[PDB]
Amino acid sequence: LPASIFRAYDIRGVVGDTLTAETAYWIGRAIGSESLARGEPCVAVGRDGRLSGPELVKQLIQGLVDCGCQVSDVGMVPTPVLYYAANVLEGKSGVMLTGSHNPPDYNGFKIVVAGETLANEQIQALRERIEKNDLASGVGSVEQVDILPRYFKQIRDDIAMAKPMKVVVDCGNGVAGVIAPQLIEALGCSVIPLYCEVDGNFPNHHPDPGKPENLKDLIAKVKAENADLGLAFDGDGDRVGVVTNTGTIIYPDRLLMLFAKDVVSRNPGADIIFDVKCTRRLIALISGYGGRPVMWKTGHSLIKKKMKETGALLAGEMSGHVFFKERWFGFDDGIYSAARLLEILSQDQRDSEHVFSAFPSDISTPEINITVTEDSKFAIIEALQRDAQWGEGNITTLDGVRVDYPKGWGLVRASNTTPVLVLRFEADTEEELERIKTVFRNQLKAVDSSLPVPF
Ligand SMILES: [Zn+2]
């Protein structure tokens, strides 16, 4: 098997190329073996709306079956619906066959075993099982399970909208189209659908709401139709993007402010987790309402683990994964997060533009990317962590180098998947912002004077 498909938080490859049917089988074999080792013979299996789904999933299922596992096949569903299955079915294991937000040819696996979402060394351990033939053998079973109606009802029964809203819903032709428009409607909204037909060719924009260019059609439709809100889901439904009635994009750190206010209001002292890319204003907001802010690493799987470790009721990260434990199950779920957002907004007399603009904000840069090289990217961060002088800033090295100052903050980290440094800066004033940019510019240039620093 190619080692490269075994990534930090999932398995991902190009179907017919680095991910063949044979490899999918051996992966199912590895996962079923790991599940049995943890005392869990019952595994749910789901797939998104990709072209290779209906056939590749059979290999995954056969791999699991050939271990002696009891497979519950939930068919084509959003990723968090698969996570839901692995919470309400007999078994606490689940495999989602998905290529997320990537081009049509990509597919892969997101993996929960006996309640744990696998990351890092646990994903490498699956490959090692295959290479070592450390695999179970048995005669397993397959049961067809229709879980979407249970998921639908679960959400509808617990969400209480206070006023009707008109909402544009952009699914980007991904699998969220099976439920997001119908569920939002059932909550008491009018829904304007955009690209809600499931189509693995992704013939319109690719379903990745983290890139503003993929929100252009959403913003245009919201304004044209005088809608109250726009929502965009990623390909598999574990992420959501948000635009207000005037078309302002609301980033996940700002969405988390609204969610934290609400959750902490019912749950004094609750831990709330966010990643190192989130605004410092979110830290103050959480603390101000009496919650405990916990800053952690970027990365869906890691945030999820941290939630279990801290007992946090809510977590989110800047790419759009939002995790509710309060009233829910603790997994990331763009569809449920959209329902929770609608619940809050419906209770307010203000438009969604003014709900969000009431919150404090720093002056911030956009996210900055600098392309370096695969040979240099981690060493640049190490040099910054080892040799840079940051003055009196609170330095966080959980994930790159973040420095929080009394009036601003800055981050540089290396991308896991590309030869790129990722940066963001904020401050309460322009003067302070420039001071913080200069500290980072200077520290970077002190590592390599030819680094292409664009700020
Ligand atoms: Zn996703």
Residue 319: C-alpha distances to residues 99, 239, 281 (Å): 16, 8, 18
Check: CATH 3.40.50.300 for 244-362? no
Distance of CA 237 from the midpoint of ligand 1 (Å): 6
9 annotated binding-site participant: yes
Query: DSSP of 42-110, one letter per residue?
Result: EEEEEE-S-TTHHHHHHHHHHHHHTBT-EEEEEEE--HHHHHHHHHHSS-SEEEEE--TTS-TTEEEEE
Backbone angles phi, psi at 378, to 5 degrees: -70, -35
Q: How far, in Å, CA of 310 to CA of 332, rounded?
A: 16
In the numeric block, which tokens belong to residue 136? Answer: 């179970």
Tell me if 265 is assigned to a ligand binding site. Answer: no
CATH class of the region 363-455: alpha beta
**Residue 100 annotated in ligand binding:** yes
Distances (CA, A) of 107 to 11, 22, 235, 247, 312: 8, 14, 11, 32, 31
Q: How far is CA 449 from CA 368, 438, 455, in A?
A: 18, 14, 14
142 beta partners: 71
Q: How far is the CA of 387 from the centre of ligand 1 (A)?
A: 37
Q: What is the resolution of this structure in A?
A: 1.9
Phi first, then psi, for residue 310 (nearest 5°) are: -100, -10
Check the annotation: does 300 bind a ligand.
yes
Strand partners, 97: 47, 109
* Most distant CA pair in the chain, distance: 68
Q: Which segments of 168-296 does DSSP mark as H helices, in order? A: 180-186, 216-224, 252-266, 280-288
CA of 238 to the centre of ligand 1 (A): 5
Is 141 an annotated catalytic residue?
no
Q: Residue 449 C-alpha to ligand 1 middle, in angstroms?
A: 38
Helix axes 21-37, 121-132, angle to 10 degrees: 110
Q: Which of 100, 301, 337, 352 is catalytic?
A: 100
12 an active-site residue? Answer: yes
Please list every residue in the chain followed by a chain break, i.e. its C lies more than 2.5 Å from the next written N.
Answer: none
Measure the CA–CA gap between 427 and 431, rounded to whole angstroms.
Answer: 9
Tell me phi and psi for residue 191, to 5 degrees. Answer: -115, 125
Q: Which CATH superfamily is domain 166-243 in?
A: Alpha-D-Glucose-1,6-Bisphosphate, subunit A, domain 3 (3.40.120.10)
Annotation-wise, does 320 bind a ligand? yes
391 burial type by CB count under 10 A (0-12 exposed, 13-18 middle, 19+ buried): exposed
Q: What is the spatial distance between Cα 234 and Cα 171, in angstroms, rounded to a whole number?
A: 7
Q: Which residues lie below 8 Å from residue 131, measured CB to CB, with a gap of 6+?
A: 1
Separation in Å, CA 156 to CA 112, 175, 202, 239: 25, 19, 29, 19
d(CA 86, CA 89): 6
Give the separation between CA 441 and CA 433, rounded to whole angstroms. Answer: 12
Determine whether the annotation assigns residue 244 to a binding site: no
Cα(236) to ligand 1 centroid in Å equals: 5
Report CA(223)–ligand 1 centroid distance (Å): 26
205 given a catalytic annotation: no
**Domain 1-146 identical in fold to domain 166-243:** yes
Query: Domain map of the chain by residue range?
Result: 1-146, 166-243, 244-362, 363-455
Q: Is 13 annotated as a binding residue?
A: no
Sign of the CA dihedral with 168 first, then 244, 260, and 431 last: positive
Cα 71 to chain centroid, rounded = 26
- Residue 236 annotated in ligand binding: yes
Inter-residue contact 228 to 168 (CB < 8 Å): no
Q: Tell me the two tokens of residue 241.
A: 């993007």
The rounded distance, in Å, linking the Cα atoms of 71 and 74 is: 9
CA of 20 to the centre of ligand 1 (A): 22
Among 129, 321, 340, 424, the active-site one is: 321
How many A from CA of 231 to the centre of ligand 1?
A: 14
Asked: is 1-146 a CATH 3.40.50.620 domain? The reply is no
Q: Which pair of structure tokens corresponds to residue 141?
A: 């079973």
